[PDB]
Design an enzyme around this catalytic site. Structure first.
Site, short mmCIF file in Angstrom:
data_model
loop_
_atom_site.label_atom_id
_atom_site.label_comp_id
_atom_site.label_asym_id
_atom_site.label_seq_id
_atom_site.Cartn_x
_atom_site.Cartn_y
_atom_site.Cartn_z
N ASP A 100 4.73 7.04 -8.19
CA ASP A 100 3.33 7.48 -8.01
C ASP A 100 2.38 6.33 -8.13
OD1 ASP A 100 1.50 10.09 -9.79
OD2 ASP A 100 1.18 9.37 -7.76
N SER A 101 1.13 6.55 -7.70
CA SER A 101 0.07 5.55 -8.01
C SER A 101 -0.38 5.77 -9.44
CB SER A 101 -1.06 5.67 -6.97
OG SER A 101 -1.47 7.02 -6.91
N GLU A 141 -5.16 -11.66 -1.67
CA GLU A 141 -4.45 -11.79 -2.94
C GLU A 141 -3.00 -11.38 -2.92
OE1 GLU A 141 -7.38 -12.72 -6.19
OE2 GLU A 141 -5.34 -13.18 -5.57
N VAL A 161 -3.54 -15.62 -10.68
CA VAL A 161 -3.43 -17.04 -10.37
C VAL A 161 -4.08 -17.37 -9.04
CG1 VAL A 161 -1.79 -18.86 -9.81
CG2 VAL A 161 -1.24 -17.15 -11.62
N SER A 199 -6.63 3.08 -7.95
CA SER A 199 -7.71 3.82 -7.31
C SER A 199 -8.44 3.00 -6.24
CB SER A 199 -8.80 4.23 -8.28
OG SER A 199 -8.57 5.49 -8.88
N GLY A 200 -8.82 3.72 -5.19
CA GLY A 200 -9.57 3.10 -4.10
C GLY A 200 -8.68 2.47 -3.06
N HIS A 232 -15.50 6.88 -7.16
CA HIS A 232 -15.50 6.68 -8.62
C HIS A 232 -15.26 5.19 -8.94
CE1 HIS A 232 -11.01 7.33 -8.11
NE2 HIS A 232 -10.99 6.42 -9.09
N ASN A 292 -0.66 -12.65 -6.31
CA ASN A 292 -0.82 -12.73 -7.76
C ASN A 292 -2.29 -12.66 -8.12
OD1 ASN A 292 -0.97 -13.51 -10.44
ND2 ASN A 292 0.99 -14.66 -10.29
N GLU A 331 -6.71 -16.92 -0.95
CA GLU A 331 -7.77 -16.00 -1.35
C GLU A 331 -9.11 -16.24 -0.69
OE1 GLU A 331 -6.21 -17.94 -3.70
OE2 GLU A 331 -5.14 -16.64 -5.08
N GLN A 355 -3.18 4.07 -13.00
CA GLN A 355 -4.50 3.47 -13.29
C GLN A 355 -4.50 2.01 -12.83
OE1 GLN A 355 -3.50 6.09 -15.39
NE2 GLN A 355 -5.28 7.28 -14.75
N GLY A 356 -5.56 1.69 -12.02
CA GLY A 356 -5.70 0.39 -11.38
C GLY A 356 -5.44 0.45 -9.88
N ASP A 369 -14.53 11.81 -2.50
CA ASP A 369 -14.33 10.56 -3.27
C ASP A 369 -14.09 9.38 -2.36
OD1 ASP A 369 -14.00 8.85 -5.42
OD2 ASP A 369 -12.00 9.67 -6.01
CA LIG Z 1 -4.38 -14.97 -6.49
#
Ligand SMILES: [Ca+2]
Lengths: 220, 56
Positions: A168-169, A52, A57, A174-175, A40, A54, A62, A171-172, A84
């Site tokens: 819990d996990s 990553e 920033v 996922s995956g 999804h 932060n 990165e 929104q954001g 999924d």
């Molecule tokens: Ca960063």
């Protein structure tokens, strides 16, 4: 992640962010050219962000690499959420940031795992973190998972978390990864709200997909 | 009218920005969609939202 803690910069080196002009999903690096995420989380134009901490920033460890292929499981069902899982190929190999191993066997109820991500940290309300968040949580039995979500849990799903709520996990997330003794056992997938009593998170059961992941990666 | 339904995040755990028509405000507004089980007041652009729901 609700109820978690600050991981520490680059302490989860296999965690990636999927970016479409902003962070929308996590993923797990499983070799220098491939990421595992949720079906999804499919979008065209994904950029994978590795190294990553932060998310808002530039800190310098990165690597930003475009997805060259974003392959949804051929049996993903967007109504039942079965299967999924998605494999993303990186347009160039990442500089190793480190990969996580696939399981050799499924994990059992009570195994402690590490779940991580840049998702909402509130169970009622909205606060998105700058830095990566971590949560330790146990795998739950299939019987408890099915009583929490009657009629909804397939053989390719498992629950993990705390029935009393608060951890819990969200929104954001996922995956992203659920790692248990150094193996990627789960993918953050769905639940009823976040961190609600009696409603643990539901995760794609990666151990069921290892032959498919290996063969699909090698055929692309 | 589906344009008059409140926006639906759904059960999946992504943080995807979508548009919904807000009839109280007379505006297409953004919200967080979790990635699955979308209802119809859920659009990938403000232009798609206004085209389908403007004036509802
Ligand atoms: Ca960063």
């Amino acid at each position: 992640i609700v109820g978690g803690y600050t991981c520490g910069a680059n302490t989860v080196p296999y965690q990636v962010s999927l970016n479409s002009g902003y962070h929308f999903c996590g993923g797990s690096l499983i070799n220098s050219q491939w990421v595992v995420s949720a079906a999804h989380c499919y979008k065209s134009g994904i950029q994978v962000r590795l190294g990553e901490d932060n998310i808002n920033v530039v800190e310098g460890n990165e690597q930003f690499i475009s997805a060259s292929k974003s392959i949804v499981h051929p049996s993903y069902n967007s109504n039942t959420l079965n299967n999924d899982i998605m494999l993303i190929k990186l347009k160039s190999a990442a500089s190793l940031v480190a990969s996580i191993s696939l399981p050799t066997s499924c994990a059992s109820a009570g195994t402690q795992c590490l779940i991580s991500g840049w998702g909402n940290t509130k169970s009622s309300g909205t606060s998105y973190p700058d830095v990566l968040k971590c949560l330790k949580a146990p795998i739950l039995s299939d019987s408890s998972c099915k009583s929490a979500y009657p009629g909804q849990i397939t053989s390719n799903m498992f629950c993990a978390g705390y029935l009393e709520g608060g951890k819990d996990s969200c929104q954001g997330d996922s995956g992203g990864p659920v790692v248990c003794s150094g193996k990627l056992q789960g993918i953050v997938s769905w639940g009823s709200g976040c961190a609600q009593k009696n409603k643990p998170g539901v995760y794609t059961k990666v151990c069921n997909y290892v032959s498919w992941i290996k063969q699909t990666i090698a055929s692309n | 009218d589906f344009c008059l339904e409140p926006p639906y995040t759904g059960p999946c755990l992504a943080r995807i920005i979508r548009y919904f028509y807000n009839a109280k405000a007379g505006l297409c507004q953004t919200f967080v969609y979790g990635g699955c089980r979308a209802k119809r007041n859920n659009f990938k652009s403000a232009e798609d939202c206004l085209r389908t729901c403007g004036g509802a």
